[PDB]
Amino acid sequence: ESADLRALAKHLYDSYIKSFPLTKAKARAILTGKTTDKSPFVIYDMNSLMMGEDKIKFKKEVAIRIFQGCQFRSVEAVQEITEYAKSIPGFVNLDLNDQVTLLKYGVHEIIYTMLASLMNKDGVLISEGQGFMTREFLKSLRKPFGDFMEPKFEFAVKFNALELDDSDLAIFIAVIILSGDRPGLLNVKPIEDIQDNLLQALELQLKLNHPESSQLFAKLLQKMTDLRQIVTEHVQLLQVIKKTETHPLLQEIYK
Amino acid sequence: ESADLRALAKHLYDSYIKSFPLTKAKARAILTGKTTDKSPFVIYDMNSLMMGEDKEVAIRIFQGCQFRSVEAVQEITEYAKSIPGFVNLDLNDQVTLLKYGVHEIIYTMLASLMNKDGVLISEGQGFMTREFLKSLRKPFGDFMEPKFEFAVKFNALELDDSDLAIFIAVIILSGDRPGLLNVKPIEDIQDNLLQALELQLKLNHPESSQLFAKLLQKMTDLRQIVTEHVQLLQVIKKTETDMSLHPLLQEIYK
Numbered sequence: 001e002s003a004d005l006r007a008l009a010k011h012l013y014d015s016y017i018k019s020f021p022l023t024k025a026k027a028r029a030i031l032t033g034k035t036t037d038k039s040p041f042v043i044y045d046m047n048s049l050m051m052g053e054d055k056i057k058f059k060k061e062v063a064i065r066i067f068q069g070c071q072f073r074s075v076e077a078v079q080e081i082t083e084y085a086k087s088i089p090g091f092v093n094l095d096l097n098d099q100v101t102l103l104k105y106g107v108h109e110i111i112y113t114m115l116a117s118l119m120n121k122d123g124v125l126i127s128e129g130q131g132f133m134t135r136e137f138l139k140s141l142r143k144p145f146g147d148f149m150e151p152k153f154e155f156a157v158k159f160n161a162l163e164l165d166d167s168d169l170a171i172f173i174a175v176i177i178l179s180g181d182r183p184g185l186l187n188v189k190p191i192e193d194i195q196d197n198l199l200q201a202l203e204l205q206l207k208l209n210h211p212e213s214s215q216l217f218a219k220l221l222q223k224m225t226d227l228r229q230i231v232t233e234h235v236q237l238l239q240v241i242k243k244t245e246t247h248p249l250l251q252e253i254y255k
Numbered sequence: 256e257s258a259d260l261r262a263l264a265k266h267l268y269d270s271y272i273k274s275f276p277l278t279k280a281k282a283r284a285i286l287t288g289k290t291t292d293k294s295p296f297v298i299y300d301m302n303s304l305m306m307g308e309d310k311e312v313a314i315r316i317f318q319g320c321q322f323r324s325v326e327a328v329q330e331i332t333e334y335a336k337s338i339p340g341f342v343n344l345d346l347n348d349q350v351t352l353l354k355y356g357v358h359e360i361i362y363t364m365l366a367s368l369m370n371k372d373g374v375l376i377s378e379g380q381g382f383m384t385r386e387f388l389k390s391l392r393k394p395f396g397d398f399m400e401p402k403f404e405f406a407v408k409f410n411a412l413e414l415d416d417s418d419l420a421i422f423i424a425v426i427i428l429s430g431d432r433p434g435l436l437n438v439k440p441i442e443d444i445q446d447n448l449l450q451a452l453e454l455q456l457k458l459n460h461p462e463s464s465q466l467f468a469k470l471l472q473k474m475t476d477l478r479q480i481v482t483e484h485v486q487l488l489q490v491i492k493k494t495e496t497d498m499s500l501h502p503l504l505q506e507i508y509k
């Protein structure tokens with residue numbers, strides 16, 4: 001029933017709002033919108049970073065400090081996604097090991113997805129949107145550290161061309177979470193059952209919310225390939241970094 | 256409109272039949288014992304391979320894959336030209352689309368000739384076991400296994416040739432290929448192709464919920480298979496310096 005699908009869609013939207021502080025709506029307004037109330041601090045070079053470190057406080061080489069800050073934010077994002085996942089109908093009733101498996105393999109795909117919401121072609125909103133770090137400044141960090149954000153920007157530019165909103169993304173990230181092809185899964189059936197229902201909800205959502213955008217559903221699904229490729233090359237970029245940035249309690253938090 | 260999309264489905268099925276002489280319908284008939292077709296000779300060890308070679312082994316098998324891949328590129332190229340709007344695209348983009356599409360198509364269609372236990376070879380005259388392929392010398396016993404693992408999952412979708420004709424068309428017309436000059440005419444064609452796939456799947460598989468979505472997600476599997484495979488070919492290039500990729504395949508890889 002369309003009624004049940006639209007019910008599922010609104011439920012996911014409501015939970016997404018409750019779980020993620022900085023939404024796309026709020027981030028687009030900050031980046032370029034009729035919001036001129038407050039203004040992010042711009043970080044475009046080394047001096048502005050130092051300047052940004054004193055005013056806004058972050059709760060040793062510059063390129064390393066930035067890397068570690070990304071790790072801290074990554075860890076915060078995991079917990080927000082984890083909370084969101086619990087609201088997806090059926091999710092908590094899955095085998096406990098499968099829940100952990102889906103989250104483990106899914107978080108990065110979602111992190112890169114939602115990061116696009118905070119990006120344009122020229123930079124990324126940082127620290128709850130109190131800041132703005134430029135694409136150029138990130139490009140110039142060093143020999144290993146100057147490459148990890150560029151692929152994310154490249155994906156975002158393309159992904160953002162789809163012009164999805166929060167209500168669209170809520171269902172999309174749920175589809176991502178309930179993938180039955182994650183390795184080590186024990187009971188693939190109810191996962192695929194839920195994803196099929198989420199997929200139906202996403203399709204109707206896109207058809208109602210973007211009636212003039214032909215085949216948007218298909219094109220969104222095709223992006224999942226871009227995401228998986230980006231996750232894979234990221235872990236690959238981290239293995240090389242591990243052989244440069246060669247605290248024991250900190251390395252536990254960031255395993 | 257329904258009618259226009261159905262007419263597109265038929266045209267692509269028609270050209271598929273004309274371009275690919277070993278179809279999935281035929282492959283299944285050979286693999287399951289149907290009387291429409293004849294049973295293959297089975298290659299499972301060195302001696303059966305020796306007995307089979309009427310109509311180094313690891314190398315010979317590897318070259319057999321090369322010739323078959325080259326033959327496949329040719330058939331895919333013939334098929335592509337039938338895709339409405341494809342030949343009217345910038346020539347450089349035609350080359351680019353073929354360059355990045357062929358292998359994804361090859362591994363897709365190779366599943367049609369596979370079951371959990373092996374693969375049809377030499378136009379269905381032969382059947383080479385999965386196990387025999389693993390037993391090959393260290394740099395050659397690796398390349399087939401992930402194709403099998405893909406095939407076992409891809410085959411679970413139960414697509415037939417008329418489904419595959421459209422899906423492969425969708426693959427060729429990907430606007431996201433590296434170095435494309437005019438993305439928009441390509442994406443306009445793929446959009447019409449995707450609509451045609453969607454309707455085909457829902458008419459041909461009415462009981463199969465979100466098959467369209469599940470099929471598209473398989474393109475992720477394909478792209479990883481290509482990447483894995485390239486890395487594996489680089490190993491072989493460095494070990495066997497007396498050996499040579501086919502020029503057509505050399506040109507494609509880059």
Ligand SMILES: Cc1oc(-c2ccccc2)nc1CCCc1ccc(C[C@@H](C(=O)O)n2nccn2)cc1
Pocket residue numbers: 058065066067068069070071072073074111115124125126127133138148149
């Ligand atoms: C580029 C950037 O810099 C800051 C930032 C920098 C200094 C202070 C506060 C925030 N926030 C951002 C936004 C990017 C957020 C972000 C979140 C997660 C990840 C993946 C994360 C991971 O591997 O899980 N990672 N840690 C290090 C490198 N990659 C990468 C990037």
Ligand SMILES: Cc1oc(-c2ccccc2)nc1CCCc1ccc(C[C@@H](C(=O)O)n2nccn2)cc1
Pocket residue numbers: 315316317318319320321323324325361365374375376377383388398399484504
């Ligand atoms: C396993 C097998 O053996 C024979 C065969 C063996 C001896 C004589 C004739 C055919 N045909 C097959 C099935 C073809 C499977 C197949 C087809 C294409 C490709 C890709 C092809 C490529 O990379 O273009 N390749 N060449 C070498 C390794 N990979 C990889 C594998």
